[PDB]
Amino acid sequence: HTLVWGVWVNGVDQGDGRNIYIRSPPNNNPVKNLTSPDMTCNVDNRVVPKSVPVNAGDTLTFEWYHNTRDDDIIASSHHGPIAVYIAPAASNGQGNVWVKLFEDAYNVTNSTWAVDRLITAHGQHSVVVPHVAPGDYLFRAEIIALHEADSLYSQNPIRGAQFYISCAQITINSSDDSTPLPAGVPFPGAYTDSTPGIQFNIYTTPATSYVAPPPSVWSGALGGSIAQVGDASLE
């Protein structure tokens, strides 16, 4: 149970974005139904009044929280991967539009899941803004909690993989468009009951064997991190 509070651009806090530049859902409950319209941008997908200005090559940092800013972030039980997708905003996230910029699942070197490192990072994970066409975009940040993912939601709706999905409105101003954005995958639709990484038993299956759900990270993606960029306590 986690939500995005706001974003940072090059380590500068853009301030509370809830219902302002984030398409915030009403609460931190997960999405679990893979065929739900709620898979796109969570349960309250609508245009919000602001879009955060960035340039290509900026560091864009998402900041998550549980109940209050810079708290426990997400229950430690919620081991799983983190992904970020991008789509042109005029799509409203509909159709074959979502392109993956970032994936971090289980780090063998560190013996930690992305969610474990997100807590350590005070809820902060980042991407490099890609060199796509200038214009308005949705950045879809997706945490998958796998602590109840041994079941399919479609078999037992009390369990299943848990999707924490947050869509930020981002406007890319300066971009040379060296990597034009291709078509991508649909949400809902890209994840199904047979997709690798959706049904996974963290109690019995080693995390070293986990394969995160496709699609693969786009060739145009410039990277990211799970690391504290900004100290919310200094504000």
**Binding residue (CB under 5 A) for Cu ion from 1, 18, 147, 159:** 1
Q: Which neighbouring-strand residues pair with 142?
A: 83, 165
Partner residues linked to 170 by β-bridges: 52, 137
On the CB side of 38, CA atoms within 13 Å amount to 16
Stretch that binds Cu ion, among 1-9, 32-40, 62-70, 199-207 (CB under 5 A): 1-9
Count of residues engaged in binding Cu ion, rule: CB under 5 A: 1
Which sign does the torsion angle of CA 53, 68, 45, 105 carry? positive
Segment 182 to 221, residues that bind Cu ion, using CB under 5 A? none
Q: Find all residues with CB under 8 Å of 95, minimum gap 6, and list them.
A: 186
9 is in an annotated binding site: yes
69 scored as a contact of Cu ion (CB under 5 A): no
Ligand-binding annotation for 108, yes or no, is no
Nearer to Cu ion, 1 or 50 (CB): 1
For Cu ion, the nearest residue by Cβ is 1
Tell me how far, at minimum, the Cβ of 117 lies from Cu ion, in Å.
17
Contact 109, 162 (CB under 8 A): no
Q: Report in angstroms how near the CB of residue 30 gets to Cu ion at its nearest.
A: 6
Would you say 127 or 146 has its CB closer to Cu ion? 146
Asked whether the beta carbons of 177 and 134 are under 8 A apart, the reply is: yes
The response to whether 23 counts as a known ligand-binding position is: no
- For the annotated binding site, the residues are 1, 9, 47-48, 58, 67, 78, 129, 140, 147, 162, 164
Binding site for Cu ion (CB under 5 A): 1
- For the annotated binding site for O2, the residues are 147, 162
